[PDB]
DNA sequence: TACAGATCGATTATGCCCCAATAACCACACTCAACCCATGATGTTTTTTATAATGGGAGCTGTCACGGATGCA
C-alpha cells in the first residue's frame, strides 16, 4: 500500500443502526501512523498506531 | 611185480613286553596392566579501579474477522 492518505468506509459494522462510518488514514513511508475515525453518534476521533 | 605209510619241513594260529608315541595333571615365571602420589603447569575465581558521568522506550505493531463473554459507568 502506497504512502499517502486514504479514506475508507464501513458496510454494516454497526448492526444497531446500519450507518456508514467513514475514516481517514495517514500512512507515511516510515514513522507512526495517524487515523481519523467517525462514530455512530457522529463524533470525530483520532487513533495513533 | 603194485599198492600203502613215515619224518623233514614249511605257513598259520594266539598271546604279550616293549614301547614309541599318547594325553592329562602339576610345577615355576616374565610381562603387562592397574592404581596411587606426587610436581607442576594450567585453569578458574575473587578483588579493585577515586575527574565526572543521574529516566530506554528500539522497535514496535501495520493492521481478518467472527462470536462469547465480560467488566463496567
From Swiss-Prot:
Reported biotechnological use: Co-administration of salinamide and rifampicin or salinamide and myxopyronin suppresses the emergence of resistance to both antibiotics.
Post-translational modification: Acetylated on several lysine residues in the presence of glucose.
Domain of life: Bacteria
Subunit structure: The RNAP catalytic core consists of 2 alpha, 1 beta, 1 beta' and 1 omega subunit. When a sigma factor is associated with the core the holoenzyme is formed, which can initiate transcription. The rRNA transcription and antitermination complex (rrnTAC) consists of RNAP, NusA, NusB, NusE (rpsJ), NusG, SubB, ribosomal protein S4, DNA and precursor rRNA; S4 is more flexible than other subunits. In pull-down experiments interacts with CedA.
UniProt family annotation: Belongs to the RNA polymerase beta chain family.
Function: DNA-dependent RNA polymerase (RNAP) catalyzes the transcription of DNA into RNA using the four ribonucleoside triphosphates as substrates.
Record protein name field: DNA-directed RNA polymerase subunit beta
Organism for this UniProt entry: Escherichia coli (strain K12)
Range covered out of full length: 151 to 199 of 1342
Amino acid at each position: 500500500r502506497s504512502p499517502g492518505v486514504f479514506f475508507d468506509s464501513d458496510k454494516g459494522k454497526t448492526h444497531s443502526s446500519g450507518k456508514v462510518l467513514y475514516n481517514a488514514r495517514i500512512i507515511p513511508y516510515r514513522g507512526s501512523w495517524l487515523d481519523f475515525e467517525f462514530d455512530p453518534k457522529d463524533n470525530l476521533f483520532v487513533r495513533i498506531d
